[PDB]
């Protein structure tokens, strides 16, 4: 009764955890607590096997631990700056090579899987700082330039016509812009990691830069030059929808250095580079 | 089950591409790879006929290549400027002879067909530049003057009453104006090209200017003179809806020069006028 | 048109909202999905896999594989202590384990924990060890006698190299905070010598032990949050 399915969605009780059953004292030659970690399998012993448990009816649910929930929250992935200082024509537009590698918070979550396939919801938060006192009427244009399409080189480049590319025009004082994007890869899943090159020579590139080309985000202040200078900062947020992930992996332990690479820095006293806190000795809690 | 039709629309799987079937070694006197291009027909050979193919289940779809999709995206077709410099009465209004020939991006796509019939969705993006610091309360009026109707000659011309013409009033700070227009021609399709004249003498006009009269777009700042000068730029975007196109043609290879004409400029070294890049020789990839 | 009443909240952007929005690439058809081994659907699948505890993470060991091993050897005094750690899933020696890292993305936890130990001495080395769990409301045990009054497993080393001790969920409240917060501090795991570490002549007089941790069938995490086990102190550049 799917309706029953709907009620479970509303209460977040789709995936229930099992109950603890009552157990008793035992004396046998089946020793569940004993095993061999060498096998590469986790011992499957439960509390009822080691202690004498009572019967407890588990109410906990695992909905929130789903991959959909874990990766389904908007996080900042970029902060775009259009700062008008001394030349409107040169400073009223910019571009960004799209990627989910610049902000540690969301990059780390996605990188807990080797491959992930998902649709994206992009939300933009623009804020206009009145450096001289007035913002006038700010209208912005954010254009998605897929790899190959012409990239604008001036604030009036013909590419801003957007004859085929997707552009979102936002007007100051209206709700934050937002749109969805379907799974964009030429493969079946996005590579979070890639142990490969784009050639077989000492100068070939290594890593996800070979596979994760997403294009460019070109943006500009549509409004023409105003007397008062403004600094417009547009923060881009991303959220994964309808997610699937494969082959889980260890979380990033040290800080990120660059995009598309697992490269890291190591100082002279390494314990400062990882979250591991030095213990005084084996017996000091 | 039209509902089934709806599901295909949602997933964009209305037009599927065929599968590749398994083929085998052959020895016969039917040679599909051989033919005669003189006939004006393309050889109909498929991969299974030349190599030995495996069976592959094609999932690709052609929805996005439909004429509806190709021409169904808003592109800029005009950028209107009302720049208040020294005379509000003369500079607060203007007019434009409507056409889809001024912006190369969309003009080129439409011109890949000889005739096209479609409804139009017009969206306007106005931006008010505060040249002196304030924009006040800007209210704009965009009026469609079909051929024959009186064109305004002053900011207070009686024609702005719009007793019968369609006008869209936009107030600064409200969503971008948008409206639809039905197929407007006096013929069954719009002429993208026209090998004809409006007379039979050496002074008759040639081309689409003879057939594509769409009228004028008259606009003005409704607000009366304000102390601070503003520059209002309104960009008009057009999108074709419910499209049909006939007789496809070669894409424009050189830059456009003027509206309604296929005229072009040619420099001394012609390879700079076309997108063709000079090859070093026949064997240099 | 239909009269409407715009409600508070309209126009805002909540990072955790669940709305629909227009698609920037209409008519686009995504690449067909192929089968890839190893699909994960719920993070609980990762919490149920054992990972090593950097239990010997003293300062001189961090940065070495030896931060993962505890050394055992012939004792001259009886019932000596081997190690002692807090049992809290996101507390310190176990914060960097996989279950500890995932638990650090959630605010609450519940359920039983499974600690396993694998002896790595020679096949001719014997040993009996007592692994104990001390429920809260008391200090960490100071002797084997004090420790064995709590939940415990006496492990006899033999053909099967590994043993498991289950820390049952024994709490006042149905959940506890994952972050180090007294009220919901779960107790301790201590290890002591039950007999001794005996070896025949010509055999190494010391041996290591590896420690693992994972969650039982009742393990569960709640209230997603950002982690404090990783940070960014400057721009990540191209």
């Amino acid at each position: 009764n799917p309706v029953e399915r709907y009620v479970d969605e509303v209460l977040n009780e789709v995936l229930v955890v099992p109950n603890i059953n009552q157990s008793h004292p035992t004396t046998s030659n089946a020793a569940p607590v004993l095993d061999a970690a060498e096998t590469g399998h986790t011992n499957k012993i439960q509390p009822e096997d080691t202690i004498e448990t009572r019967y407890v009816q588990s109410s906990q649910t695992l909905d929130e631990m789903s991959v959909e929930s874990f990766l389904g929250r908007s996080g900042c992935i970029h902060e775009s700056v259009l700062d008008i200082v001394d030349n409107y024509n040169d400073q009223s537009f910019t571009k960004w090579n799209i990627n989910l590698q610049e902000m540690a918070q969301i990059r780390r979550k996605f990188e807990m899987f080797t491959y992930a396939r998902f649709d994206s919801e992009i939300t933009m938060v623009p804020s206009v700082a009145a450096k001289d006192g007035h913002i006038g009427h700010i209208v912005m244009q954010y254009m998605y330039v897929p790899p190959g399409a012409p990239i604008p080189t001036t604030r009036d480049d013909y590419a801003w016509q957007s004859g085929t590319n997707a552009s979102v025009f936002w007007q100051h004082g209206q709700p934050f812009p937002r749109f969805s994007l379907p799974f964009l890869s030429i493969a079946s899943a996005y590579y979070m990691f890639y142990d490969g090159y784009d050639g077989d020579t000492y100068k070939s590139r290594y890593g996800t830069v070979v596979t994760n080309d997403m294009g460019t985000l070109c943006s500009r202040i549509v409004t023409s030059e105003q007397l008062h200078k403004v600094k417009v900062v547009t923060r881009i947020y991303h959220k994964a929808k309808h997610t699937k992930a494969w082959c889980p992996r260890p979380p990033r332990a040290v800080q990120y250095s660059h995009t598309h690479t697992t490269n890291y820095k190591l100082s002279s006293e390494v314990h400062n580079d990882v979250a591991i806190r030095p213990r005084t000795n084996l017996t000091t809690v | 089950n039209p509902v089934e039709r709806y599901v295909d629309e949602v997933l964009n799987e209305v037009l599927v591409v065929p599968n590749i079937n398994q083929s085998h070694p052959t020895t016969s006197n039917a040679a599909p790879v051989l033919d005669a291009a003189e006939t004006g027909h393309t050889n109909k050979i498929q991969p299974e006929d030349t190599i030995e193919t495996r069976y592959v289940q094609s999932s690709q779809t052609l929805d996005e290549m439909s004429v509806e999709s190709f021409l169904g995206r808003s592109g800029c077709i005009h950028e209107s400027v009302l720049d208040i410099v020294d005379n509000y009465n003369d500079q607060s209004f203007t007019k434009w002879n409507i056409n889809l020939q001024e912006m190369a991006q969309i003009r080129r796509k439409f011109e890949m067909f000889t005739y096209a019939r479609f409804d139009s969705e017009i969206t306007m993006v106005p931006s008010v530049a505060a040249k002196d610091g304030h924009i006040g309360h800007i209210v704009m009026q965009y009026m469609y003057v079909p051929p024959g109707a009186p064109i305004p000659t002053t900011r207070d011309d009686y024609a702005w009453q719009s007793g019968t013409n369609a006008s869209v009033f936009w107030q600064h700070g409200q969503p971008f104006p948008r409206f639809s227009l039905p197929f407007l021609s006096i013929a069954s399709a719009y002429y993208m090209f026209y090998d004809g004249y409006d007379g039979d003498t050496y002074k008759s006009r040639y081309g689409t200017v003879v057939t594509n009269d769409m009228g004028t777009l008259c606009s003005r700042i409704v607000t009366s003179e304000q102390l601070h000068k503003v520059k209002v730029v309104t960009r008009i975007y057009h999108k074709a809806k419910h499209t049909k196109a006939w007789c496809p043609r070669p894409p424009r290879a050189v830059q456009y020069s003027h509206t309604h004409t296929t005229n072009y400029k040619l420099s001394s070294e012609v390879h700079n006028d076309v997108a063709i890049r000079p090859r070093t020789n026949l064997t240099t990839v | 048109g239909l009269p409407v009443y715009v409600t508070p909240g309209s126009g805002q952007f909540m990072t955790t909202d669940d709305m629909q929005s227009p698609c920037a690439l209409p008519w686009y058809h995504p690449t067909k999905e192929i089968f890839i081994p190893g699909e994960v659907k719920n993070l609980i699948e990762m919490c149920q896999v054992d990972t090593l505890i950097p239990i010997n993470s003293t300062q001189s060991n961090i940065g070495n594989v030896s931060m993962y091993t505890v050394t055992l050897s012939p004792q001259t005094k009886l019932a000596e202590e081997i190690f002692a750690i807090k049992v809290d899933i996101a507390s310190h020696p176990l914060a960097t384990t996989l279950i500890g890292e995932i638990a650090s993305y959630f605010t609450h936890w519940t359920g039983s924990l499974r600690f396993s130990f694998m002896f790595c001495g020679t096949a001719n080395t014997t040993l009996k060890v007592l692994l104990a769990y001390t429920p809260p409301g008391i200090g960490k045990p100071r002797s084997r006698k004090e420790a064995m009054l709590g939940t415990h497993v006496v492990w006899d080393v033999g053909l099967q190299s590994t043993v498991s001790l289950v820390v049952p969920w024994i709490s006042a409240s149905q959940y506890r905070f994952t972050t180090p917060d007294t009220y919901s501090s779960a107790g301790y795991i201590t290890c002591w010598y039950q007999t001794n570490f005996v070896v025949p002549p010509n055999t190494p007089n010391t041996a290591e032990m590896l420690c693992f941790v994972s969650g039982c069938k009742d393990f569960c995490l709640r209230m997603a949050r950002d982690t404090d086990l990783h940070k960014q102190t400057g721009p990540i550049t191209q």
Partner: peptide
Amino acid sequence: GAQVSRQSINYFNINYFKDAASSGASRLD
């Protein structure tokens, strides 16, 4: 268009746009 269901507590599960990428979070299990 959307999937009305009945038992009476209807669950009008609407999808307002014509693309699959446009809908909200997925159902679990």
